[PDB]
RNA sequence: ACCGGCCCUCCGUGGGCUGCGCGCGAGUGUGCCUGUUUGGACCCGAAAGGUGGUGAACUAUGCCUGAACAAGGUGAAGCCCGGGGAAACCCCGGUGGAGGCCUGUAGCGAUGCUGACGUGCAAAUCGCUCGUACGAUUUGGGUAUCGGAGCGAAAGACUCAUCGAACCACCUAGUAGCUGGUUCACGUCGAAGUUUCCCUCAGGAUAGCUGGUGCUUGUCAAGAAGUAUUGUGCGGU
RNA sequence: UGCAGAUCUUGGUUGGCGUAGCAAAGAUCUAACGGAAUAUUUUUAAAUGCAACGUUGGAUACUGGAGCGGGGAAGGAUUUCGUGCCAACGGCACUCGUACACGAGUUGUUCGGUCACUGAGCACAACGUUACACCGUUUUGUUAGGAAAGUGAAGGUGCUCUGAAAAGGGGCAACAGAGAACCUGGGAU
RNA sequence: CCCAACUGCAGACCGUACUCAUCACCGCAUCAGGUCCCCAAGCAUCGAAUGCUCUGGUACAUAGAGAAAGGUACACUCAGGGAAGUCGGCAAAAUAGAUGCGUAAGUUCGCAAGAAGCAUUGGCUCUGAGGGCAAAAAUUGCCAACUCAGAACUGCUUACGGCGGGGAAUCCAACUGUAUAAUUAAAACAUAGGUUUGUGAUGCAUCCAAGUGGUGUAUGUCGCAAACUGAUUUCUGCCCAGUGCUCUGUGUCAACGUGACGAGAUUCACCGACGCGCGGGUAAACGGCGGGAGUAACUAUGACUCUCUUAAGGUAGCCAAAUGCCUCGUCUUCCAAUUAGAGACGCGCAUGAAUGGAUUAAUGAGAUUCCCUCUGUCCCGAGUUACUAUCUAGCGAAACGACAGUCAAGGGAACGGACUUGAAGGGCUAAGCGGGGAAAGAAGACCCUGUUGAGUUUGACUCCAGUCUGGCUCUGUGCGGCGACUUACGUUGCUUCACUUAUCGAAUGAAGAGACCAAUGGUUGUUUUGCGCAGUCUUCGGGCUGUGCGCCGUCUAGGCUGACGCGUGCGGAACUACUGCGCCAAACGGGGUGGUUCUCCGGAGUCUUGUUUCGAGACAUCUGCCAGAUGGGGAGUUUGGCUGGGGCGGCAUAUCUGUUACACGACAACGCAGGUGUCCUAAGGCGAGCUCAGUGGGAACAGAAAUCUCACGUGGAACACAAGCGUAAAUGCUUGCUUGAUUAACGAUUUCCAGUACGAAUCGAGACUGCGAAAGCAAGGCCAGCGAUCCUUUGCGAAGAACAGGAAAUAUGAACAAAUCAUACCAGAGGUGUCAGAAUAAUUACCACAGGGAUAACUGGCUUGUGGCGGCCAAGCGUUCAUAGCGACGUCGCUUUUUGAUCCUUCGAUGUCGGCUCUUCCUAACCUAGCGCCGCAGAAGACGCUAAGGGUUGGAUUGUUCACCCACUGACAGGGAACGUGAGCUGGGUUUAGACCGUCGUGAGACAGGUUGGUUUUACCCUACUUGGCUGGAGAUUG
RNA sequence: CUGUGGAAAUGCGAAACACUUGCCAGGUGACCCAUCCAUCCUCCCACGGUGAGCUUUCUUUUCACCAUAAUCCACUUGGGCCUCUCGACUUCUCGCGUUACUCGGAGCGGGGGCUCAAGAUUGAAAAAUGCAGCUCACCCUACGUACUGUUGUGAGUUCGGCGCAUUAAAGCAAAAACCUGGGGUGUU
RNA sequence: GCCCGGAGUCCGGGCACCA
């Protein structure tokens, strides 16, 4: 046979992610002794729009720490943020929307977005459009907060991680039918090549385990092992079960 | 009878087997022809397999930076002015110019005549007719992804007239129980398509039929005869 | 070391045969001149030198500005110009020619490129891997366990010492992106 | 030294001609193909449509003459009828601009829509409406542009170009789009909408020979990766038995470990993970979703009942549907007539629910039926044009070419140009034509064979990457816990907890770590910080253990309490406010030392048993090496034979009996009738006694059949089994005793046969025996019942005796000895049934090669069962009467228009159904001519004779031949000619590649099932035929 | 005096309104459709002067031409802003403006100003050029010399108005080079 | 063939195959 499309992506040729019309990656500001001991004020200068992504991004102003010069940030905004207004990030921050905090320091059941993960990551949680995290309980014996995940996983945290306060701007945005193929053309121009589909039983024998035959149909069990080799783990992968779904849906993941 | 070897018995000047043994040597070197075997192997011929390199100017898909798209039809939201009504709200006339909207040039394609040509203008072209024509649109240059690999809105399509595994050189004069060929004269002889075994049934080995070289002899006849006679046996058509 | 055949190899010759044809894009006519291509006869004029070629004037007609108009890129590289010339070539013809021969022609402070920008990208150095570099990384601000700055602010001396500050090696990739100081007339071919 | 206005001098390098295309580029070429950018006039007109023209550019494409046939056309017209043509309205005709009026069902309310349909349109002369700029303003004056609406008069030959035909229905796909360059544009793909799965980064998917390597990821669940279905509306039923996927506590599974016997190799015991088994879950995972009886007041049907059975027994819906074999189903409608269309019905070979069911407005170069309009598609053809062909001037090929070119019959390799017999035939030739040359092209692609392949699949055989799992190593420090070992003290195997230096993850331009707040810290230190107590050692110098006291060692924003003590705190000087945008750097000062110059110290806290900082941490998410499972993701190879083709079937593949078999022996077929892979310690061996099957006469229950008795009884019984042969004081039956079913020095021979082996059998010699009084019989059960090389495995070569290897002691392990281990020689056993003996699953319609007429699918040839057409005899039918007309039970033929049987010709090719067109032949006579006969009154008919000269139709449905209806007629006969006729046509069907459905298969795929779409090439040669001309010749050229 | 004028929008240029690659911050480069108005230019008309065409009859007629490069100097239309009006919708429903989807106490409109963009006019260049006519005029062989002439309210047309500027789950590259300022140096 | 388990021993499992 041939290589399946699934394993051709993995050498990334024409399968790279689109760019050129980027501005970078979104972080928080970089952890140092000023943030760990005071707070630094920044303040918003301008609500962008990356293609390729949902969510808007701002670009915050602040001094440098040491230098007679201006360090200029780019974050995601949460909702209501406006240009003009004030981000203070540190541990003697004030608690308001838009301040960056140590997670030791927000009561329980607040709202946080860009949550890190570890300290200094500068954020990896809660990013997407409409997401936030739940603060559930500090546990001040061992320094470790718990938090629920947009997916309804719990984690725990050291407590020197940083959070910002509120949710993530530009909910809502998979509510609206698209209706057209060419509404999903412009949608993945600034993702990457991954559209349209082609399913894999109308593909021929050589190319796809699903190909071939004289009625298009699967001729096997679709739930494939966790330990097949590439090329033939396409399908259901390690599925715990299959069908519709009837009552309360369980947590997904490991 | 003797030499070596394996044995049996009543244990003898018994017995019975076995050797590519002995039994007054015949070998060895060289020339030449014929036969068997390996090698390119009497001459020409596959579909395949392997090692290393060259191609994205045709064509497939992504990216960067540029260019292009007559003339009409229909008439969405927003806005203006009038009426109706107790209200809630409803109605007419304008304006405006939306849409993977319609007719239709250029452009991009290729439905029918199963038209023309079919040793052509052409190793796919020509004529009418036909699809679409502000969009998932057409197009220049640059750049990125390939050979058990690349790319694909998926037809096993396309990757320089080559693709159900490209091209170039080499291993390679690859192997072929199968098809084709195989160059002077006269003379003496002259067949078989049957038996047994073989993954054997388009092929071999084996016996038979044939040729050559003879050896030992005889000469009217030995171990002669696809025939009779006499005698003596066999038989169930 | 002897050939009649192997859809045998390489040359030459051959009927078919002066045959099949040389039928898309409408089309040419006339006088004069040129040319060896005539108005060519011994044995009145027609019935015995046909047919065809270039230039100029006139006639007729086509392309019909999405042009058999005027300029460029890719590609080609003397096909450009003058004079001469008709053996072979332009599947008919040639006195014509992008044919053949002999000589000529391309001029920039300002036009294009470059000096001198970055893009999709490439891959020297450094490091690592490989039996073997002919392998990998090398723009998400950016090489390398990584000492890669050779520049020089204020100040002293005299008419040339001491040192503040600067993180992230060296290149290439656009003749349609960025950039770029000149215009008309000519009797000047 | 800086500058303004001038001025003086100098301004480097490469490109520059021409072209950019119906002749300069790529297509072998000056090729009707292809190739990016800029400039773009006038009139008609909505106009970059189309037609004509000024500027600029061309007259370059081989020409002249000129009404043959047949052709091509970006050329036309036809009376009357109007799809009767055809598979099919293919092709052509036809509608058409603008303005006014008007417009159906259905619908997602947007559309459908230009729905459908009616009317007007020229020319000329007039009239009205629609505006700007000025002024001392419902006024006056001046002036531009081309639309719209009307009136009178007058005319038509309906008159350029350009420009939708429309309607009623069924099937499929929602729509725009994509897509097999060069035979398939579609119902296929995509799409929006819907559902499911994995996954919180030391992740999921995944590239890669390898590394601190790479992609989704410049990302973070409203994300990324992997599948299925395919808009909206209304819905999506039951099954976890099978296969798969997935989640939890003890049988089995490997290395490594831990112990034993032994001198050691060897060997044994214990321990030992994932996985597999057990126990759960899961169908929008692959898939699946029944039989048989009876039963209601006429019959029918069966609401009801019973029965067998499943994991569940097809629910809502829908149907002779692109799915129904029978089948042209049955009813209605459409027509004069319908294998067609629509609407109904449903025990549905084999419909059915995201392998999606049902329905759907709009859309479609998609499939099908009907209607209006229109027509040369047709009845049935005719006339005209331009370019060819035709003749001439110039120029000038190819294909093909054994040799050649008149027929009839015959035989022949079964369809001759050559051969046999007959019949024609003077020579040369121009234009046509498609009967023959089984004409040309291409070593047949269909079918079969080869110990040839390739693409694809999986439950084939043998393996490899990847993933998971165990062991050791990487690997360090303490305090404990639970066991083990050996005579409570020492090691060790697992572990709880606390550490940090190995290692791992992340961030940062390695940008402020920890302490100073003080110990179950160290105190041998940069330039001289140690001092006691107790115990115990000593090289007599001083150590070690445990303890104390000094030293290392130290500052600070704030806030409480009594400058200065104590506690707290832990490195701190921040506009408010409810939410909204200011500037900050290259040091001021102050002390010490130098002469208000130059330097040090603060401003700006000190210190370092040292790690850049966080997180984890001796684990794995790390490195390496062994071990196990999984693993069509990938590699390699295989997938019997015979055969009235091959396949399915069968075994004629190793073997036994009777017959074919022709009176020695031998003899074939997928010939006939039957057997074999076993069974028996007795069913083997011997001695003795006896006589079987059956029949007849007799005896309580007792009978046709129980037991007893007498007689006859040539085997009619028995002998394991198939059959044949054989046997009577026995080869049979009963009984007694036994192990000849052992060993048997390589004795010889028969059968098959090469005079090989294997199996079976025959005649002997030697040992020890059995039964017999003995002679004698017996080393299986008479003849069928079985197996090479290599490899594995068992038995025999006991103990002693021999001054030496001998008649009689098995041999070797090569320098030699002791004990193990291994090997050799002889006789058996574990098996090859394809049986003289390889280790072996599928598919190809995407297909390939070498060959085969040794072999199938057409024609032809032999045959004629079957099909068709006839005779002879005469039981009966015919009011009686065998024979007007028929004729059973039987029997004799003919034909090659059916289909079988065979395999002779053709596989380096003879174009494979039907229709259209055209000619000819046959007679078994439908009509037409003339007759005989009747159950012939007339009329209409039945049967038969001579006779093939003439004739033999128009339509609906279907690809059809065939079939069946409507209509006309004198009649609507049957057949042949390579199942006449494709270089004559057509291409509907059949039979490639795309795609859908049903059934089958795990799958790739299959179906003589249904459906839609799918290049039809060449004549100029010879002959034949049709016309057209030139010209010799009687010794048919001469005598 | 030590740049300077104006209450303000912001103006003033012979060389001190000098330097600023120590440093820092902005901007240009730099990106967006369609409608409407519309540049350079083209085509039509009107006005008429040079030469040709036609003229049996008509035609104050038909045709050709009628031009101004770069560079430099000195009233309109549109946008933004300042000032005054002791500042408008006080009051049953205010006002300005576009073909068009709207704007105003966070300051409409009106008078007067400042500034930017696109044009108009005037002049230097520049008539000395170019294009036609005459060329039996005045010459002779010279490319020879004199001389004459030199309106649009139309219809098209992307330069510009024009962007924080299009459908948008699509939101329109970057850098060199250059410009200005904050601080600082400098003049008295 | 090995290990088992359940009945001198027949079945059910998990493994292993040079005549
Ligand atoms: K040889
Ligand atoms: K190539
Ligand atoms: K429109
Ligand atoms: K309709
Ligand atoms: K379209
Ligand atoms: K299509
Ligand atoms: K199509
Ligand atoms: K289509
Ligand atoms: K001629
Ligand atoms: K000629
Ligand atoms: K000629
Ligand atoms: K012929
Ligand atoms: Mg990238
Ligand atoms: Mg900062
Ligand atoms: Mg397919
Ligand atoms: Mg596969
Ligand atoms: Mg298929
Ligand atoms: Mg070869
Ligand atoms: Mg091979
Ligand atoms: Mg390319
Ligand atoms: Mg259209
Ligand atoms: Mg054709
Ligand atoms: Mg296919
Ligand atoms: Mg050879
Ligand atoms: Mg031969
Ligand atoms: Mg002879
Ligand atoms: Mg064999
Ligand atoms: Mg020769
Ligand atoms: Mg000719
Ligand atoms: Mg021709
Ligand atoms: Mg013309
Ligand atoms: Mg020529
Ligand atoms: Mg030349
Ligand atoms: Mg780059
Ligand atoms: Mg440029
Ligand atoms: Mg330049
Ligand atoms: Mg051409
Ligand atoms: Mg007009
Ligand atoms: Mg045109
Ligand atoms: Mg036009
Ligand atoms: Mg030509
Ligand atoms: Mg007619
Ligand atoms: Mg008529
Ligand atoms: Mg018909
Ligand atoms: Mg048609
Ligand atoms: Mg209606
Ligand atoms: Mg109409
Ligand atoms: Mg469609
Ligand atoms: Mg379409
Ligand atoms: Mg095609
Ligand atoms: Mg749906
Ligand atoms: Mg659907
Ligand atoms: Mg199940
Ligand atoms: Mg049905
Ligand atoms: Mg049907
Ligand atoms: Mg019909
Ligand atoms: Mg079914
Ligand atoms: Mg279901
Ligand atoms: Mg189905
Ligand atoms: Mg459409
Ligand atoms: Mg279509
Ligand atoms: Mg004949
Ligand atoms: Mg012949
Ligand atoms: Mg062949
Ligand atoms: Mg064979
Ligand atoms: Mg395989
Ligand atoms: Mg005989
Ligand atoms: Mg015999
Ligand atoms: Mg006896
Ligand atoms: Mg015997
Ligand atoms: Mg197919
Ligand atoms: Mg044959
Ligand atoms: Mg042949
Ligand atoms: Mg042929
Ligand atoms: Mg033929
Ligand atoms: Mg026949
Ligand atoms: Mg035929
Ligand atoms: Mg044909
Ligand atoms: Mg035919
Ligand atoms: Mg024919
Ligand atoms: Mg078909
Ligand atoms: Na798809
Ligand atoms: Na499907
Ligand atoms: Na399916
Ligand atoms: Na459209
Ligand atoms: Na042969
Ligand atoms: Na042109
Ligand atoms: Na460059
Ligand atoms: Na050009
Ligand atoms: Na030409
Ligand atoms: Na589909
Ligand atoms: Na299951
Ligand atoms: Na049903
Ligand atoms: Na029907
Ligand atoms: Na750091
Ligand atoms: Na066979
Ligand atoms: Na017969
Ligand atoms: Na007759």
Not at 60 to 78: N, T
Request: proline fraction near 6%; aromatic fraction near 4%; include cysteine.
């Amino acid at each position: 046979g041939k290589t399946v499309l699934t394993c051709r992506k993995g050498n990334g040729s024409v399968y790279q992610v689109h760019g050129h019309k980027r501005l970078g990656p979104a972080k928080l500001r970089i952890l140092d002794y000023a943030e760990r001991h005071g707070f630094m004020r920044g303040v918003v200068k301008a609500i962008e729009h990356e293609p390729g992504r949902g969510a808007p991004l701002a670009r915050v102003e602040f001094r440098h720490p040491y230098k007679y010069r201006r360090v200029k940030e780019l974050m995601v905004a949460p909702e209501g943020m406006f240009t003009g207004q004030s981000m203070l990030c540190g541990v003697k921050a004030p608690l308001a929307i838009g301040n960056v905090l140590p997670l030791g320091q927000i009561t329980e059941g607040c709202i946080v977005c860009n949550v890190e993960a570890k300290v200094g990551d500068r954020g990896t949680l809660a990013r997407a459009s409409g997401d936030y995290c739940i603060i559930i309980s500090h546990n001040t014996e061992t320094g470790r907060t718990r938090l629920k995940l947009p997916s309804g996983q719990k984690k725990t945290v050291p407590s020197s991680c940083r959070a910002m306060i509120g949710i993530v701007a530009g909910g809502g945005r998979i509510e609206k039918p698209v209706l057209k193929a060419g509404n999903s053309f412009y949608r993945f121009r600034g993702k990457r090549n991954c559209w349209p589909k082609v399913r894999g039983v109308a593909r021929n024998p050589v190319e796809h385990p699903h190909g071939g035959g004289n009625h298009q149909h699967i001729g096997h069990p679709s739930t494939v092992s966790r330990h097949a080799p590439p090329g033939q783990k396409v399908g259901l992968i390690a599925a715990r079960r299959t069908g519709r779904i009837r009552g309360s849906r369980a947590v997904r993941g490991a």
